[PDB]
Amino acid sequence: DIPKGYMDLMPFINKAGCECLNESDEHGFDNCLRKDTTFLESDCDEQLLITVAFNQPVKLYSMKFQGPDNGQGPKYVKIFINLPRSMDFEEAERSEPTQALELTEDDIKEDGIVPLRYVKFQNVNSVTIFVQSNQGEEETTRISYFTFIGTPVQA
Amino acid sequence: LQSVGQIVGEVLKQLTEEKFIVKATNGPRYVVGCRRQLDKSKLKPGTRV
Amino acid sequence: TRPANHRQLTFEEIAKSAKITVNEVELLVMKALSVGLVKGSIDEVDKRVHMTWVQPRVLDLQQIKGMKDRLEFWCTDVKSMEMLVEHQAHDILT
Amino acid sequence: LREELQLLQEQGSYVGEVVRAMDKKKVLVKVHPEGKFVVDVDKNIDINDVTPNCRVAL
Amino acid sequence: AVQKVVVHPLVLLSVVDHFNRIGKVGNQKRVVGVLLGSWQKKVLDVSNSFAVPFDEDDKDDSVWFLDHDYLENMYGMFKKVNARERIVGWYHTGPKLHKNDIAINELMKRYCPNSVLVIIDVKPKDLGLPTEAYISVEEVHDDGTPTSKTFEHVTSEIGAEEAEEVGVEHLLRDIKDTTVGTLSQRITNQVHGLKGLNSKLLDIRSYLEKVATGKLPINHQIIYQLQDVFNLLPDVSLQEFVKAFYLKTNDQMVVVYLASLIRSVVALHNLINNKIANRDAEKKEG
Amino acid sequence: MVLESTMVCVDNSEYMRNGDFLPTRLQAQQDAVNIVCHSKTRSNPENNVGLITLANDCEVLTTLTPDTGRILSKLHTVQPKGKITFCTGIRVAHLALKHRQGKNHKMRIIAFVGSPVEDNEKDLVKLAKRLKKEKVNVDIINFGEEEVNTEKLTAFVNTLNGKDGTGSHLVTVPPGPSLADALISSPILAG
Amino acid sequence: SLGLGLAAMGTARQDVYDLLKTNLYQDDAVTGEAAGLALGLVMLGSKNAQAIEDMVGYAQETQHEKILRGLAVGIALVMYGRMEEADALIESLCRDKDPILRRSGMYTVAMAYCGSGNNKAIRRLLHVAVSDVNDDVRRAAVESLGFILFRTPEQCPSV
Amino acid sequence: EFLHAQEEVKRIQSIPLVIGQFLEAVDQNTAIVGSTTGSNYYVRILSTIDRELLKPNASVALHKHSNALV
Amino acid sequence: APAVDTAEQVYISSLALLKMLKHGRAGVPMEVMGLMLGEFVDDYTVRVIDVFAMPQSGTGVSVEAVDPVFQAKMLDMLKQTGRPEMVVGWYHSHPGFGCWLSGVDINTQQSFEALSERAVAVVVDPIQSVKGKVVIDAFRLINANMMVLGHEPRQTTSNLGHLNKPSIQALIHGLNRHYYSITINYRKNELEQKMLLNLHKKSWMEGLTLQDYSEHCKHNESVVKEMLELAKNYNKAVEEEDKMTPEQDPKRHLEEHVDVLMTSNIVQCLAAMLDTVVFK
Amino acid sequence: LVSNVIELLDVGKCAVIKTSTRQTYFLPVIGLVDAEKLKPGDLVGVNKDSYLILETLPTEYDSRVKAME
Amino acid sequence: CTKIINADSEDPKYIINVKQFAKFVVDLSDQVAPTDIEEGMRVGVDRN
Numbered sequence A: 001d002i003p004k005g006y007m008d009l010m011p012f013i014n015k016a017g018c019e020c021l022n023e024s025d026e027h028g029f030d031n032c033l034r035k036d037t038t039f040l041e042s043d044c045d046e047q048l049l050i051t052v053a054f055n056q057p058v059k060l061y062s063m064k065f066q067g068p069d070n071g072q073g074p075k076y077v078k079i080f081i082n083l084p085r086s087m088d089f090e091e092a093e094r095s096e097p098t099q100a101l102e103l104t105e106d107d108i109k110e111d112g113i114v115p116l117r118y119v120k121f122q123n124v125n126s127v128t129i130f131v132q133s134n135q136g137e138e139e140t141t142r143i144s145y146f147t148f149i150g151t152p153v154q155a
Numbered sequence B: 001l002q003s004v005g006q007i008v009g010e011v012l013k014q015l016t017e018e019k020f021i022v023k024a025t026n027g028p029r030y031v032v033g034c035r036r037q038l039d040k041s042k043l044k045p046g047t048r049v
Numbered sequence C: 001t002r003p004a005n006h007r008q009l010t011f012e013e014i015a016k017s018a019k020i021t022v023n024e025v026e027l028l029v030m031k032a033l034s035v036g037l038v039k040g041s042i043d044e045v046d047k048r049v050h051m052t053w054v055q056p057r058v059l060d061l062q063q064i065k066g067m068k069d070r071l072e073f074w075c076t077d078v079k080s081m082e083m084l085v086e087h088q089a090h091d092i093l094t
Numbered sequence D: 001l002r003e004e005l006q007l008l009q010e011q012g013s014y015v016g017e018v019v020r021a022m023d024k025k026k027v028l029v030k031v032h033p034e035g036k037f038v039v040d041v042d043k044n045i046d047i048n049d050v051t052p053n054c055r056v057a058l
Numbered sequence E: 001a002v003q004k005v006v007v008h009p010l011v012l013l014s015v016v017d018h019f020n021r022i023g024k025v026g027n028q029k030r031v032v033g034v035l036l037g038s039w040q041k042k043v044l045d046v047s048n049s050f051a052v053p054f055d056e057d058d059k060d061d062s063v064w065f066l067d068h069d070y071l072e073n074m075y076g077m078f079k080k081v082n083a084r085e086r087i088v089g090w091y092h093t094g095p096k097l098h099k100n101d102i103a104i105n106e107l108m109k110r111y112c113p114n115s116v117l118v119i120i121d122v123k124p125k126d127l128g129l130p131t132e133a134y135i136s137v138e139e140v141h142d143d144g145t146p147t148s149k150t151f152e153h154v155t156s157e158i159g160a161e162e163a164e165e166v167g168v169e170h171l172l173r174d175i176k177d178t179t180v181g182t183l184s185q186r187i188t189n190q191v192h193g194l195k196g197l198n199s200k201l202l203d204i205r206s207y208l209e210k211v212a213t214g215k216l217p218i219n220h221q222i223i224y225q226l227q228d229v230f231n232l233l234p235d236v237s238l239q240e241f242v243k244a245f246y247l248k249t250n251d252q253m254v255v256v257y258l259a260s261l262i263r264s265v266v267a268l269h270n271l272i273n274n275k276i277a278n279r280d281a282e283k284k285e286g
Numbered sequence F: 001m002v003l004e005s006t007m008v009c010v011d012n013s014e015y016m017r018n019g020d021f022l023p024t025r026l027q028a029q030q031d032a033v034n035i036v037c038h039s040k041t042r043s044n045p046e047n048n049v050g051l052i053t054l055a056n057d058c059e060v061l062t063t064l065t066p067d068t069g070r071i072l073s074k075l076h077t078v079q080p081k082g083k084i085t086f087c088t089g090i091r092v093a094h095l096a097l098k099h100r101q102g103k104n105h106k107m108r109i110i111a112f113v114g115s116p117v118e119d120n121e122k123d124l125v126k127l128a129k130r131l132k133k134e135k136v137n138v139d140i141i142n143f144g145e146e147e148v149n150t151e152k153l154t155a156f157v158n159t160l161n162g163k164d165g166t167g168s169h170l171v172t173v174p175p176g177p178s179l180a181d182a183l184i185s186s187p188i189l190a191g
Numbered sequence G: 001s002l003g004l005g006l007a008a009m010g011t012a013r014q015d016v017y018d019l020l021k022t023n024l025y026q027d028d029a030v031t032g033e034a035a036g037l038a039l040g041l042v043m044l045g046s047k048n049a050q051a052i053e054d055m056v057g058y059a060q061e062t063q064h065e066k067i068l069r070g071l072a073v074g075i076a077l078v079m080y081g082r083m084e085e086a087d088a089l090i091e092s093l094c095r096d097k098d099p100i101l102r103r104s105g106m107y108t109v110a111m112a113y114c115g116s117g118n119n120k121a122i123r124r125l126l127h128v129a130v131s132d133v134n135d136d137v138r139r140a141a142v143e144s145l146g147f148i149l150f151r152t153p154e155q156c157p158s159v
Numbered sequence H: 001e002f003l004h005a006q007e008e009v010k011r012i013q014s015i016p017l018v019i020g021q022f023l024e025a026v027d028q029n030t031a032i033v034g035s036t037t038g039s040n041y042y043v044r045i046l047s048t049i050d051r052e053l054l055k056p057n058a059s060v061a062l063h064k065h066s067n068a069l070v
Numbered sequence I: 001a002p003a004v005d006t007a008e009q010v011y012i013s014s015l016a017l018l019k020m021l022k023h024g025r026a027g028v029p030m031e032v033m034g035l036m037l038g039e040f041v042d043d044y045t046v047r048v049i050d051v052f053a054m055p056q057s058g059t060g061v062s063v064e065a066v067d068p069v070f071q072a073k074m075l076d077m078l079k080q081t082g083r084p085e086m087v088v089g090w091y092h093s094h095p096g097f098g099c100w101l102s103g104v105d106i107n108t109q110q111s112f113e114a115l116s117e118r119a120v121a122v123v124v125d126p127i128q129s130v131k132g133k134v135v136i137d138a139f140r141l142i143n144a145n146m147m148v149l150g151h152e153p154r155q156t157t158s159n160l161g162h163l164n165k166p167s168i169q170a171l172i173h174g175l176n177r178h179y180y181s182i183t184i185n186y187r188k189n190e191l192e193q194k195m196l197l198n199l200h201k202k203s204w205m206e207g208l209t210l211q212d213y214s215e216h217c218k219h220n221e222s223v224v225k226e227m228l229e230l231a232k233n234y235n236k237a238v239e240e241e242d243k244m245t246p247e248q249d250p251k252r253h254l255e256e257h258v259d260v261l262m263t264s265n266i267v268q269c270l271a272a273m274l275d276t277v278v279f280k
Numbered sequence J: 001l002v003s004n005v006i007e008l009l010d011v012g013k014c015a016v017i018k019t020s021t022r023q024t025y026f027l028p029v030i031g032l033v034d035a036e037k038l039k040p041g042d043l044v045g046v047n048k049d050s051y052l053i054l055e056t057l058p059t060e061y062d063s064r065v066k067a068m069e
Numbered sequence K: 001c002t003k004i005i006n007a008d009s010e011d012p013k014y015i016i017n018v019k020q021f022a023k024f025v026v027d028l029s030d031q032v033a034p035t036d037i038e039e040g041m042r043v044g045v046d047r048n
């Protein structure tokens, strides 16, 4: 897939910065990271907060934020960038995101690629996703596959 | 080590309340101002500075 | 009790109010100035005392409201006259 | 005023006594106290106008 | 202690850059840093600062983090670069003091015994509030009142040394400046002074409103100084000061008349030269 | 074996002014933090350790540093001359962990309570819910006062360990032989 | 992008506008000039609210100055020949802090009042040319006078 | 702008300045000056200086970094 | 082969320029140096957001003056604060030497460019930066193979790269032969400018404070006496105007004194009476 | 850089020297040596940039005293 | 070159008089042994 001139940003992801809050121990953060049927599930409630850092600064164009069809796919996502400190759910709800995202149903499918405002993502070091709600309004949310499409800034 | 040393010269004239014609020894002469806190009254001509 | 409108007070006022003879008002103001309470002066020829005193006190919330009204007068004068100056100098303020 | 300000920030030119106009492009000139050099001549100045023992600017 | 705090126009820029840098995503709205500078038992100047990773929680306004080891490490770097500057105090934006200021000040008191807080307001720069300096004091509240901490205000100035005034001047030189004060700018300054006086008066009146209705407790020294100010007002009646007319008329003559006459005569002479030069050119046209 | 940043929470309240342990309850918690920090550091050489007091305010004397000696030195000169304030202490420790260097480190704090926590159960349970929200493995150890593992602490852990949560093991120390082996048998095996 | 804008000049077709807006959103300095200029060319004289809001917002959001220049000329072109209907936009560009956006405001004055000789436009242009602090804005303000006054060339040297 | 330019011209007359001897006037704005550092320089005369005050061997203060006859 | 455009600019932030000037002066007469942080936005832009000084070493300014420990720790802790900007380039001070790159300067710049092809080597003269003008330039390099082959160092596509002329002092020290000057633009937003404006923003008070009235009268006396002498000179000169066909002015000085008198006295009068009527 | 210490003055002592670049030079602090012997004529090695007496070195000669071996 | 300052491999500095220029106390380059350097011989030295 992916638009011409871009690449999957998987090899540029630094595992030292990755950190997901409210995840069930049985459903690890790597499940959403990996392109398998394995999924990441929130453990406390629907809200989730996943921070991913990169080895080198990168520029994002589109995200593949997809989950299952049972309605537990995300629906409202606040994206913050270059966070100098770990993110708190209270502030994340309060804070103004770099980009707000109302994930329609079609995004959650396997062919769902969500374009991002490339203007605001030109010096991304670490990207934090605050999943505020899910489609089915369940007590928890599942993410089948999450990744980023973009290009390195060639540091 | 934070001191840099200083030229030594002789005050030739009091051009005004601030501008002092000062001749460095064995060198050129300048017009130079004085420090903010100093006894200008004691900056008589010929006073080594 | 006299808010600088009539700072000159005659020795009769002190004599009647303080229930003292007019001969001792000199000594009274004398002591007051000496101890640092007040910083006026005495015109004995016309029997008056100029008063510029720096001893304040507690202010009796109604008195606080009165002083706030005085400040309202002051600030409205300043605002009116800032408006006047701005209107007159509008050509050169640019 | 602006032109004077601009021209007043450029460094002064050394005066010198031209020993002799060596070539049509090089001039041997002695300037005190650096010593003697063989300078070149910019576009404006004509070599034939440069005569020995005349004060020039570098 | 200190009767003046001099803030150079670099800690101002450092604070503004720190605030923007954090507030890209850092919506705490208030950031905390440490300001160094040459110390004096007299007027104290500050010349450099850095920003420490600070966090604050709006709950109870008593849970907070200031990375003291990060403070130590930056101070080590700055000493290596410039040992002349020592830790003087700490700054924070968000012109509304929070509760931690004294508490945080206590933490700064260990790195600097006379640690001065310097609120450097970023956004509101209307009339006269570049920065406000406070110093903690050891007194309960007054002669006869319970205990507290009660930061004290200190006069603050903005001043630069050489090779820093040049940078400020170069970044400036818009249609602004014109250090020579011409008449128009002087009248503008008078208008600005009236505006500032009115703003201060309105602040005092708002405080008096909040006190009269009982919203605020009575501050006795506040009321004492209000009485002092009200008594300090002069009188334009009392026809001995009205003889100020004298000097005003005196002012008039040197200004006005003499100057005008000279200016008018010079302009008239300039008109004669033109009215001559024009007819010279016309006659030549012959 | 596991990357982790631990904010140990030492107690210097006036209720630490006890002789339940032979020299001093404060000294017992002192070598307790010593041995626990040694175990955590030698278990994983890149782990982080920091120090938080809880008397009348929550000083942050030592933040997350892989070094142990400096935290040990800061642990000395502690002067238990205050009164505990648990909720603010855990709040400060949690946000300090939020300021951790490496984001792969599993969040965990070590809290040494030796005084009855004066609070309300509602704030305890809401704080436990918040801490579980951030995936933090708080570890609480009761010392000193005889009301060991109060209902407050029990509810706090259980809500935080909701259905096999992080492992906020509510270990109990005897009022007498609070020896180091009794302080390491349960936690090193499982917090 | 340049060739497409030249070919589609004034057609205001939606497909070409979408393609060029996508290229602009790709946010490259080299392609930004062409994308902005072609956005102006395609939607030329159309007064479109959507195109103008997209272009001004992008000019206020990006960081590549080449894109800024391209978008400046594009914003000018979009409001070509609309006369007083530009006024709002013009003010919104004359007050802007970014000097390139002020230059865009001058170019918009030129394109909007091209040939009308509207004395309000000339007054604004002369005020900017004598007052603004950025030399490029002054230059562009003086340039726009030609577009304003080309219908009465005899009056042009006089000013 | 004229006020700013006058301010800049006045600022160029600040201190320190090197003393030299006004050897010879060349043009209306350029002269040859012998700076007491022992060196002869062809420099530019500042306009505001009184021309009639420019006599040979007169002591003149020159800009430190440009030797302009200040 | 790609060629660096002549329109490329170095956008130095206000804070970066101020820190650079302060550090350069603080080390006079030594040559100080440090690292400039920022980002290479694109092929035609190099943004210097911030610059941190570096400890002075007896080496001077060389590639051995960058202590790896200092640089690494400063970068890490700045990143902690919120400034995760790469090392765009380096700066050092040539006190009184003008702006150029010496052989060792060219050497360290080669070292920096090995890290990243885009990398600037701005230099600042801290003693030539007298109030007003600021003497600072930014150079990258020219590849030797590029120059020997005869091709120009930088492609040109606009007049931006030639609005300013190179200096002779830089040119003799290798400009346009081994390194090229890059135009420098200062990124000053409204907020920073307004903050800097407070340096000489007088007060709300001095707009209302009258001059010392005795001092005012003395100044008036002195200026009026000078104006009298000037009027005598003006009369004398004008009498000559008659017996003189078209062929310092006592008039211009007269006009200047008149203007200073009127501004001073008008301001003093108005301030005095505003004071009379706003203060009771 | 070699220099002849012209003399020592009081201010807790200051010096004035004459370097071999025919230049007199006042030092508020006398470098990194002792400050008692310091004869007015004592040749010293003074730093070449910050101009403080980094070391003291033995006297050169007294002209004719060298003439006789 | 002038007096050797009694080097003995620990004080190899010598004071050298560069002609009408100044005199400086300096040390050796690695390429020359002290046996080749003695008082009163002309020596070529660097400039800083």
Ligand SMILES: [Zn+2]
Residues within 6 Å of the ligand: I031, I061, I092, I094, I101, I102, I105
């Ligand atoms: Zn260099």
